[PDB]
Every structure is written in C-alpha cells, then in structure tokens.
Design a protein around this ligand. Sequence first.
Ligand SMILES: [Cl-]
Ligand SMILES: [Cl-]
Ligand SMILES: [Cl-]
Ligand SMILES: [Cl-]
Ligand SMILES: [Cl-]
Ligand SMILES: [Cl-]
Ligand SMILES: [Cu+2]
Ligand SMILES: [Cu+2]
Ligand SMILES: [Cu+2]
Ligand SMILES: [Cu+2]
Ligand SMILES: [Zn+2]
Ligand SMILES: [Zn+2]
Ligand SMILES: [Zn+2]
Ligand SMILES: [Zn+2]
Ligand SMILES: [Zn+2]
Ligand SMILES: [Zn+2]
Ligand SMILES: [Zn+2]
Ligand SMILES: [Zn+2]
Lengths: 281, 285
Amino acid sequence: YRVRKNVLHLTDTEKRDFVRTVLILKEKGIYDRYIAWHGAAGKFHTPPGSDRNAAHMSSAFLPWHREYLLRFERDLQSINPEVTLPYWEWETDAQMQDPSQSQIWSADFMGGNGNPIKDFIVDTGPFAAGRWTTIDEQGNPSGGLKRNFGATKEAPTLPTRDDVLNALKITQYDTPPWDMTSQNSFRNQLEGFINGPQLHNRVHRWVGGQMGVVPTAPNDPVFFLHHANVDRIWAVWQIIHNYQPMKNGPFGQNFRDPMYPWNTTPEDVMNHRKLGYVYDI
Amino acid sequence: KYRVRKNVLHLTDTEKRDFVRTVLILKEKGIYDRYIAWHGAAGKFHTPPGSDRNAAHMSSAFLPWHREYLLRFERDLQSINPEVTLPYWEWETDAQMQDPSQSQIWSADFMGGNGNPIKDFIVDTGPFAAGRWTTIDEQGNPSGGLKRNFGATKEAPTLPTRDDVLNALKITQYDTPPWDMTSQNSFRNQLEGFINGPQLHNRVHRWVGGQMGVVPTAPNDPVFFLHHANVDRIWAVWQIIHRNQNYQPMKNGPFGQNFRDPMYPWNTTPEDVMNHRKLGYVYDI
Ligand SMILES: [Cl-]
Ligand SMILES: [Cl-]
Ligand SMILES: [Cl-]
Ligand SMILES: [Cl-]
Ligand SMILES: [Cl-]
Ligand SMILES: [Cl-]
Ligand SMILES: [Cu+2]
Ligand SMILES: [Cu+2]
Ligand SMILES: [Cu+2]
Ligand SMILES: [Cu+2]
Ligand SMILES: [Zn+2]
Ligand SMILES: [Zn+2]
Ligand SMILES: [Zn+2]
Ligand SMILES: [Zn+2]
Ligand SMILES: [Zn+2]
Ligand SMILES: [Zn+2]
Ligand SMILES: [Zn+2]
Ligand SMILES: [Zn+2]
C-alpha cells in the first residue's frame, strides 16, 4: 500500500520529487551509509575464503537487497511521505532501437551516458560531476559518477523481456551449493550467473562506470531503480510460489539467519506487503 | 546495572575458561566475524567523505561507537552462556610490571602469549594460536594465525601508565571542535591517544602489534575486546567525575558525530549509550 511505480508512469513532478529527495539524503549524509553497507556486505564472505558474500553469490542476494531498498525507501519517506521507490523495467527498454534514449536517462532524471572526452564522467542530469560526489572502494571521495552504456563485449545489450520470463519459469528458489554454480535456481538465474552475465549482473555491466562493479555500484542512483525491478521480478515469482536453504546452508544464508551487516533475516522480508509496499502491477 | 564487568585479574580460572570457550563458539557459528567486519567498515566510513574522521575513530563517536560494539558483543556472549560478561584488561597496572609480557592475561589458558619471532610472529600458544583460530585480512579473505609484536615499535615500546590515565580523567571537556585528531583539551582525543601519542588507546594497539596494530584487522585478536572494555571503563569513570559534563558535539558537527545521529553501521546513537547502566552493566570498580 506504498505503491512502487514503473519509471515510465511517473508524472514529471513525481520524478522531480524523487530526485529532490535523493539529493537531500545525499546532503544529509544518509546516502553514504547505503554505499558503505553494500560495499561491506560484498566483502563479507560466507563463510570466509568462500566466493559467497552476504549480499551476492549466495541465496541471500534477493532478501538482502529487498531489505536494502526497504530501508532506503523508508528514509526517502521520512523526507517526503509521498515518495516511493520506482522501478526501471529494463526488460522493456531493451526493445528500443537505442535504449540510451529511454526516458529514464532524461536530464531531469538520472541524466545520460558518460562523456567519452571526459573519460566517461556524466555531466547531464542531477548527478553529473560537480553536482554529486562519489566515493571509491576505499571510502575516499572519487571525483564523479561514470557510465558506460553497453561498452563491454560481454554485455552489449540489456536483458530482453524473454530472459525475464524464462527465469520466472524456474521452480526452485535456489539449489545447493547455494553459490554461482547453482543450477535450476531462480535466484542464481535472476542474479545473472547462468551463462553470465545475464539479467541482474547484465544490467550492472551494461551501465558501466561505478554500476559496473560491486564496491562502488550504489554511487549511481540507478542502482536503486535497477534493484527495484529485480525485487519486482522476485515478487512476481512469489505470487505463484518458499526459500532455500532453510538450515544447513552457510551462516548468513539460511532462512532464519541475520543478514549482514544487519540482524534482518530472509524470513523477515519474504512478503513485501508485510513490508508495507506493492508494485503497481 | 546487573551485569558485572570484572578485572581480568579478578577472574576465577573457570570464569576465564568459560569466557574463552564462548568466544570460540561465537567464532565457530560465524558470528565473531560479523564484528571484525563491522569495525573494518566503520573505519573506512569517513564523516564526512574525504575527511580524516571515520564512524568509529578519529572523532567524537569513538567512545559511544565502541561502547555499543562491546554491548552487542556481550549480548551475543550471554546468549551462549548467561554467566559470561566482558572482562577488562587494566593495562595501566600491567605497565608497572618489570616485564608486562608475563601478566596473567597472556597465559596459555587465556589470551595466549607473544608472537614467535622465529615464526614471523605468529602466536603459537593459547586458545587462539594459529591452527586453532581463523583470521581475516583487510579484504575479508582468510589469513595466517593471529600475530602479536609486544612493544616492538619505537613509537610504542611501553604500555600506558596510571599517570597517563589519571591526567586524562582530568580533562573537563568530552571533546572540542574540530572534533578530530587535532582536538585540544578533549577527553575523547586524549583517551583515544592522539595528543602527542601514540598514547593510551592508540598506544595499547601499537604495543600489542600484529592485527591489533592496525584498524582494518584489530578485532581479529580477542584482546581487542578486553582492551576496549578498559577504555570504556575509563570513560564510565570520567562520566562520573564530570557528572555535570555531557557529550559533544550536541549539534552542528559532522553527521554521524552528533549526540543524536545514527552510528555506522548501525542506527544507534551516542545518546542511546550515554549511561552504561541503562545498558544493563557496571564495572568491578
Ligand atoms: Cl502507475
Ligand atoms: Cl570479494
Ligand atoms: Cl501500472
Ligand atoms: Cl571481581
Ligand atoms: Cl576476496
Ligand atoms: Cl573488584
Ligand atoms: Cu550489489
Ligand atoms: Cu546489484
Ligand atoms: Cu579500531
Ligand atoms: Cu581500538
Ligand atoms: Zn504504473
Ligand atoms: Zn573478498
Ligand atoms: Zn517483464
Ligand atoms: Zn522472444
Ligand atoms: Zn506481490
Ligand atoms: Zn579512508
Ligand atoms: Zn558507572
Ligand atoms: Zn573485581
């Protein structure tokens, strides 16, 4: 009953207010806590020495990011009670002739692509360099947001709608060993590791810049619009369908286990409505 | 005000063997590691970005951050064994010893001893010797066994003294602007150890050496918690002395450093932990 809307459905004023609130969150110093939390989680392997981490490469990927967006949305709400987290339906923009033309990259929103002359720093939009500070891996100021639209040879295109529907056909949430090699797992599929980079991982690689990489991704506000759609994609599979592992998975990956760096568990966020929100569709 | 935190020198043999046993369980369950990660994350979180201050150190939130940290750690201990509380290492008395390396805190039945020069400095004695206790680097990856270099550095050859503690307790202000490493006449910056230091808190870290010597890995050594229990105790004492002296900055300080701001990576505030008793514990003395 907080309603999360397609970025395409967002009145010119709804978009202005969303952007407005993100800058305030940034100015207050709240935005940085989110970049830091995501960076910390990515370095927290479960268990140590493994490839899995608290926020990725593990069953926790989906509930971790759901909790993350919920907390982010609550902070937006405390600034402006009329603002909720919109979602970027990339599945849809992939059909465009040229996706970089999508209304999501308008100057009055998340601006555009990076400038090749400025080493791919983005100057168009509310988060252009000079208007929005970024930080690096190390937590030090980095000098500006960057974006490389489909510049990689492994990710030249956004995930096609189809890629979404096939994933939704998967019957298991996840499967052991609960890692990147999991087969027939909705979680690993949606995350993008099956014939990587696909879906989730694919959007990250397609955007480029800080979004391209784990330790700095959140620096780009589009991170939240991306994840909103991923969360929505997960909520859809759930209309039909339960989570795995329940016990016996690495600590931090189990159904009822604290999700770093919080005490939140996957169980705690299994139903989005219990969380106070619902996707328009 | 029920939970009693005791001098590591007042502990019975069993009490020590239960403390150690609970730490290993916390470790085995994977829970200990969430702590090391929290402290590492906080140290990298600058307030504000580009500054020298971070959420857990080099600023006013140094004391309440670590108090919250120990409280959470103590609660996990107790969920494992309700009779175990966090003891404190009174380093200022150990400094008196001819050879502090001999303090009972370093027994093979407690913290274990110094590192072995013959082995780079890996600690090979005690419950946390290499082979018995897993360690993590500044990247979150596994690393060789705990390491300790007792007073090996030229800057910190000795543990802080009672005189050093007393003098600090003498400061009238909790902190002063700019609320960082250069703060003068501030209890916080002096207890932390930056005034002419390395001194006090920073000095113990430097004296121990090994992972305890650097911010990103320091919690890998269980002694980190015994150290910070004494630092917390010293703060609790100061609070009593200057009853009519609250926390600072109350406001208009960097976000994350003010009296009512959330402390990374938690939502908890300095106000939330100003009175230790409200937190359910007290110190031996
Ligand atoms: Cl709508
Ligand atoms: Cl990693
Ligand atoms: Cl709709
Ligand atoms: Cl006692
Ligand atoms: Cl790694
Ligand atoms: Cl006593
Ligand atoms: Cu991520
Ligand atoms: Cu992601
Ligand atoms: Cu520290
Ligand atoms: Cu310390
Ligand atoms: Zn709609
Ligand atoms: Zn790592
Ligand atoms: Zn779709
Ligand atoms: Zn098709
Ligand atoms: Zn739903
Ligand atoms: Zn830094
Ligand atoms: Zn007291
Ligand atoms: Zn006692």
